[PDB]
Design a protein around this ligand. Structure first.
Ligand SMILES: *[C@@H](CC(=O)OCC)[C@H](C[C@@H]1CCNC1=O)NC(=O)[C@@H](CC(=O)[C@@H](NC(=O)c1cc(C)on1)C(C)C)Cc1ccc(F)cc1
Length: 180
C-alpha cells in the first residue's frame, strides 16, 4: 500500500527524536540541516537529536503577518548529516485534506502511523491559553507524547502535531514559503 510505505519512508529519512528540557519531540528534517519542532518544545543552545547532543546554530520561531505564533520553530543544526529535501511535498497554500495520517516517532515504542481521518484548516485556536494561528484540525483522540508528529498523506507533508483535548487533535500547518 503506497501511502503507508510513504509514511514509513518519511520516518526513516526525515524523522528523528529531538530531546529538550521540555521532553522528547518528533523532529521533522525538511532539507540540509534544518528541522522543525513544536515551538513549545522550546529548543535551547544544544538539543539531543536521537540521543546525540547537538548544537543549534540558529532557532527561528515562525509567526503569521499579524504577530500570532504558528507554533512551528525552524532549527538549523550543527551536524554533518544532511536531510533528504522533502520541500516538494509541502503545500503552498492552506487547505482541507480528507483521510490524513500522523507519523509518530518520539515517545513511541517504535515508528507508528495513526490514521486521524479528515482534516480541516481550522483558523486560530487557544493552546493552553496561547493564541496560535494556521491550525489543521482533525477528529482524533491524539495523546500526550504525539507532538512533533508529522501529519501526511501520500506525496504530501501537511503539518506537525501540537495539541489536542482528548477529542480533537491540531497540527501547525507546513507551508512551502516558510522553507525558502
Ligand atoms: C504534545 C506535547 C508533547 O508530546 O510533548 C512531549 C514532551 C501535546 C498533545 C496533546 C496532549 C493531550 N492531547 C494532545 O493531543 N500538546 C500539548 O500538550 C500542548 C497543550 C495542549 O495541547 C492543550 N490543549 C489545548 O489547549 C486545546 C485547545 C484546543 C482547541 O484543543 N485542545 C491541553 C494539554 C490542555 C502543549 C502546548 C502547545 C502549544 C502551546 F502554545 C502551549 C502548550
Amino acid at each position: 500500500g503506497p501511502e503507508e510505505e510513504f509514511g514509513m519512508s518519511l520516518i526513516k529519512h526525515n524523522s528523528c527524536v529531538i530531546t529538550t528540557e521540555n521532553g522528547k519531540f518528533t523532529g521533522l528534517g525538511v532539507y540540509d540541516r534544518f528541522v522543525v519542532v513544536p515551538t513549545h518544545a522550546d529548543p535551547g543552545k544544544e538539543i539531543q537529536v536521537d540521543g546525540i547532543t547537538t548544537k543549534v546554530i540558529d532557532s527561528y520561531d515562525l509567526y503569521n503577518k499579524n504577530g500570532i505564533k504558528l507554533e512551528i520553530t525552524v532549527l538549523k543544526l550543527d551536524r554533518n548529516e544532511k536531510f533528504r529535501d522533502i520541500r516538494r511535498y509541502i503545500p503552498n497554500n492552506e487547505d482541507d485534506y480528507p483521510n490524513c495520517n500522523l507519523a509518530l516517532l518520539a515517545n513511541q515504542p517504535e515508528p507508528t502511523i495513526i490514521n486521524v481521518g479528515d482534516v480541516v484548516s481550522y483558523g486560530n485556536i487557544l493552546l493552553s491559553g496561547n493564541q496560535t494561528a494556521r491550525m489543521l484540525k482533525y477528529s482524533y483522540p491524539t495523546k500526550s507524547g504525539y507532538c512533533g508528529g508529522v501529519l501526511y498523506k501520500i506525496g504530501q507533508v501537511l503539518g506537525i502535531h501540537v495539541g489536542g483535548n482528548g477529542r480533537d487533535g491540531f497540527s501547525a500547518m507546513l507551508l512551502r514559503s516558510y522553507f525558502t
